[PDB]
Design a binder for these strands. Structure first.
Lengths: 92, 92
DNA sequence: GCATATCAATTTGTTGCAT
DNA sequence: GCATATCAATTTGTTGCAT
């Protein structure tokens, strides 16, 4: 399922137009990105939570030259699945 | 940031009412879960992608008894962060 | 979140293309 | 995605409890 196919179902479920369903979904996804980036954890009950996970430098290897290198420290987006999400994917 | 706080920001950005922002967001998240559960991968450009992943059985240990046990195989919700998410969290 | 086990199995990214 | 390293810093879950 891509964004467009999701919008169709959302516009159907929420009884709104596809242009509206997209505009809201766009806003929702952009806001989650902004919030996480600003170091804020985004929690959505049932579904899950988003946060930034810190990551220190690690050793790596150049596949073309076999030469060892250091992959620099960085910040990554993370996701934790809520109870309802994990239970729909794997019922107790 | 919780759902309610996300709704407010979404309703502000998309120029819609809070009830409408919530109705869409609920539908969007509930659809995402049903799709992942039925074995479909949900891809959203910029943001990221959701999918199920199967974990094989592994050896574990009971902290209450010290007794070694086997954690059974399962399926879990997973997330891949898209380029735009990873770049707002850590700009190149 | 917190905790056992001298745990055990994930996930990713490394460069530079390619689909 | 593919092409290394007998990679390497990382997540996550055992059974429950604490907040």
């Amino acid at each position: 399922m891509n964004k467009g196919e999701l919008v169709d179902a959302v516009a159907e479920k929420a009884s709104v137009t596809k242009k509206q369903a997209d505009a809201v979904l766009t806003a929702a996804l952009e806001t989650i990105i902004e919030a996480v980036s600003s170091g804020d954890k985004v929690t959505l009950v049932g579904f899950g939570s988003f946060e930034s996970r810190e990551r220190k430098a690690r050793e790596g290897r150049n596949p073309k030259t076999n030469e060892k290198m250091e992959i620099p420290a960085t910040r990554v987006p993370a996701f934790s699945a809520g109870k309802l999400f994990r239970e729909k994917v794997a019922p107790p």
